[PDB]
Design a protein around this ligand. Structure first.
Ligand SMILES: C[C@]12CC[C@H](O[C@H]3O[C@H](CO)[C@@H](O)[C@H](O)[C@H]3O)C[C@H]1CC[C@@H]1[C@@H]2CC[C@]2(C)[C@@H](C3=CC(=O)OC3)CC[C@]12O
Ligand SMILES: O=c1ccn([C@@H]2O[C@H](COP(=O)(O)OP(=O)(O)O)[C@@H](O)[C@H]2O)c(=O)[nH]1
Length: 435
């Protein structure tokens, strides 16, 4: 005689709150699906403006965007507003009757003060880093002042390859804002010893040495890629790709924020309109006016080489990357783009722009050996064409593609049963249930 209590995922309530930007929303969202696939109740909290895009099982809550229409004023208003409204949501659910009360807030690692919201409301806090281990450690070392950041400089950090100046995360691009952006990334570590779960969207084999190094300081859980293994304009892009030859398309995307200069846009244009390959070039709506005048939701071309090109304002990038028609990825090397390509086996042309893109480029070409970085800071048509020849028209290109298929298989192994990422995510979920 007596009573039994069962803690299952279905009675455990996970809150998620990403920073409102696609390279932060996207990997959170994938992780919420995986967690829901594991039976938990998952509520994704998101700003009202991102709510729409996102809105197109997983619970969805909206909060006020909390930001009048510079980087700094926007951020302090944001910090202030979302601190209040997320704290309010947590309390809403603690009294609710439908859902279970929340056990843990997963928050983007660029909002470390959300650990205080979570703890200060008596729930666990899980920090999701949306960048690899190797660049995150650089931010930590800059935070610590572990080293000094007519001569060139090379930095030697434990468990990392030598880093040239150009290999460091690029903050100076932001000029008077470099201090804010740099602060934002280093402050990911202000309370690292206090975070209940430290999650990294990466997989162990990709960053063995530095991941183990961070594991001996912090019980970090590498859990990526969060995206599934084998979006606006899906049907359009797949139709066009379905009708191209295999291994014939150069996929070109510079992410969701970066915006190249008129001159740089022209360098790329001339390289792609004269190359021996088809091309699918994402050019965001707001960026379209920076195109060469010689060229609206999409545009179809016959290139001067007699090939075919499609300019479009947004695509399902993951599905493009996994289409047999894609030869290579010309990318700005944001970490989501880099990891999606890794998990798809697509070799890469690296045109890094700022923050962690420069360091990702370093690793893509020199550590993982799955792509080439362009040399500058304007990048000339001729330099783009050299890199296309390297990656798509050369025996080197062929080894690069082999390298990428090896990393893709390792990536699929990591998130499959008994994979290192599958283990870590199961460690997250199982301990969530513990008394
Ligand atoms: C600092 C900021 C936040 C990070 C954003 O993107 C990153 O996402 C990935 C991490 O998961 C990386 O892999 C990507 O390489 C990286 O691009 C972009 C950077 C830089 C731009 C600024 C955001 C934070 C918001 C920001 C301040 C917004 C803003 C502009 C302004 O004048 O007031 C507000 C818009 C972008 C922004 O400048
Ligand atoms: O046409 C596009 C271009 C980009 N993306 C997605 O937007 C994210 C971009 O994140 P990333 O870290 O690569 O760079 P950021 O945009 O933050 O600078 C990735 O998940 C891409 O797959 C997309 O869905 N469609």
């Amino acid at each position: 005689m007596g009573t039994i209590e069962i803690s299952s995922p279905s009675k455990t309530h996970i809150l998620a709150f990403p920073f409102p930007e696609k390279g932060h929303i996207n990997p959170m969202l994938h992780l919420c699906n995986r967690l829901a696939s594991k039976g938990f109740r998952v509520t994704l909290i998101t700003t009202i403006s991102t709510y729409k895009d996102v809105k197109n099982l997983i619970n969805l809550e909206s909060i006020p965007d909390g930001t009048d229409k510079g980087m700094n004023g926007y951020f302090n208003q944001f910090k202030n507003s979302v601190t209040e409204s997320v704290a309010g949501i947590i309390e809403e659910y603690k009294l609710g009757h439908d859902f279970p009360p929340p056990k843990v807030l997963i928050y983007d690692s660029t909002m470390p003060w959300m650990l205080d919201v979570a703890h200060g409301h008596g729930i666990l806090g899980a920090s999701l880093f949306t960048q690899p281990c190797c660049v995150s450690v650089v931010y930590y070392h800059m935070l610590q002042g572990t080293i000094d950041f007519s001569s060139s400089k090379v930095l030697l950090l434990p468990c990392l390859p030598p880093l040239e100046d150009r290999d460091l995360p690029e903050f100076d691009y932001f000029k008077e804002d470099s201090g804010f952006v740099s602060n934002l990334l280093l402050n990911q570590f202000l309370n690292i010893d206090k975070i209940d779960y430290v999650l990294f969207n990466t997989f162990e084999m990709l960053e063995s040495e530095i991941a183990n190094w961070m594991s001996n300081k912090w019980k970090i859980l590498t859990i990526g890629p969060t995206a599934p293994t084998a979006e606006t304009n899906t049907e359009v892009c797949m139709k066009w790709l379905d009708e191209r030859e295999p291994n014939s398309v150069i996929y070109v995307s510079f992410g969701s924020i970066a915006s190249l200069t008129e001159q740089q846009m022209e360098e790329i244009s001339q390289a792609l309109f004269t190359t021996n390959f088809n091309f699918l070039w994402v050019v965001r709506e707001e960026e379209r006016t920076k195109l060469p005048n010689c060229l609206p939701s999409s545009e179809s071309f016959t290139t001067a080489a007699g090939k075919l090109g499609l300019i479009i304002n947004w695509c399902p990038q993951l599905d493009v990357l996994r289409h047999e028609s894609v030869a290579c990825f010309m990318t700005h090397c944001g970490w989501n783009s880099t990891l999606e390509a890794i998990s798809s086996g697509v070799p890469m042309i690296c045109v890094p722009q700022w923050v962690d893109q420069t360091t990702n480029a370093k690793f893509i070409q020199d550590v993982w050996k799955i792509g080439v970085r362009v040399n500058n800071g304007l990048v000339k048509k001729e330099e783009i064409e050299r890199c296309i020849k390297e990656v798509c028209e050369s025996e080197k290109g062929k080894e690069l593609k082999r390298n990428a298929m090896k990393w893709k298989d390792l990536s699929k192994e990591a998130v499959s049963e008994g994979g290192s990422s599958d283990t870590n995510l199961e460690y997250f979920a199982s301990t969530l249930l513990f008394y």
